[PDB]
Amino acid sequence: DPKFESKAALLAARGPEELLCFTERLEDLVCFWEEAASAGVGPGQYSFSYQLEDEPWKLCRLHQAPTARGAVRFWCSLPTADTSSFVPLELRVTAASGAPRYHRVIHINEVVLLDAPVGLVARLADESGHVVLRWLPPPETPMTSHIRYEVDVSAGQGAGSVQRVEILEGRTECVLSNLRGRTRYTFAVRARMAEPSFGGFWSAWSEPVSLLTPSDL
């Protein structure tokens, strides 16, 4: 997954040293860490242990992957059966020798990094002099009622970012009142899970859509 690489790199920039976990569609969890691993150590040199609220302590399979240059990224992908939310999830990275490496307690619902919304369309309003934006939530993602959005209004090449509008939870359309006529606008939207029930960061920007406004009456 090439997008999964960019999601891991974004979280790595926020905090490279610590263990990083995130969920995409609330039925999964991926915990990873990038270290300056030598040529000798492999995925069998560590132990990824986890425990849910009442489930017993279990081991997660570890995968080794090369990142950037001279660095190795170890990551665990939890089974979908153990991806429950709103409950404490304890994590322990321990070398097979028994030495402690990491120790975290997270809630899956608090580390959501969604995908970019899809199906963005742009039309004129039923009333005169407005542009209506409509889009779809990230595909195959539950609880769309708690997804927040933000649309970006761009202009011609060389400049842009004319306006930034935040859309409330659940609502997937937007009306624009103050737009100049006979000009090419370019729109884009991104999604994130809403607080306090959820937490995370903004997703990637959707594929843009352009529009040319009519003459102002």
Binding site: E17, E18, W57, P88, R92, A99, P100, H103, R104
Partner: protein, 161 residues
């Protein structure tokens, strides 16, 4: 283990302040341990809840307890950067020179994440600046590996004293 002791570990990990109090009010072992040997004081310091850490210490929580990996509550708080919890454990007699199975002291873990304010507080309570871990890394060797010249100048001034 105990049914009250096992509940206290989960209540402390979940950050439920009122549950932690009412459990040991019913007679829960404040020094209960999971399969990793962690006490509620470990989990309360891990999640970063000063109000739960202080109440455990008042009810008689072992401040020098170390899990099967050798990490104490002072280790975890120094890692996550909970200065108020680092200060609370020390007031109750926390061992500042405790080492884990990596030979790392709280001075090592704090310097590895650049927690400048915690490194100074640990040094004021008698932290061994010359302590080396299993890799032969002192608290100064770590500062050179990460490259915090701000932190690197602080420890050299402490080793000269």
């Amino acid at each position: 283990g105990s049914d009250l002791g096992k509940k206290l570990l989960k209540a402390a990990r979940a950050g439920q302040d009122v549950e932690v109090r009412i459990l040991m009010a019913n007679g829960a072992d404040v020094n209960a341990t999971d399969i990793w040997g962690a006490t509620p004081l470990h989990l309360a310091a891990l999640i970063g809840r000063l109000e739960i850490v202080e109440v455990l210490l008042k009810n008689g929580a072992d401040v020098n307890a170390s899990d099967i990996t050798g990490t104490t509550p002072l280790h975890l708080a120094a890692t996550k950067g909970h200065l108020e919890i680092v200060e609370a454990l020390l007031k109750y007699g926390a061992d500042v020179n405790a080492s884990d199975l990596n030979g790392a002291t709280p001075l090592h873990l704090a310097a590895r994440r650049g927690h400048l304010e915690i490194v100074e507080v640990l040094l004021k309570h008698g932290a061994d600046v010359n302590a080396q871990d299993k890799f032969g890394k002192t608290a100064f060797d770590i500062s050179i590996d990460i490259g915090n010249g701000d932190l690197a100048e602080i420890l050299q001034a402490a080793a000269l004293e």
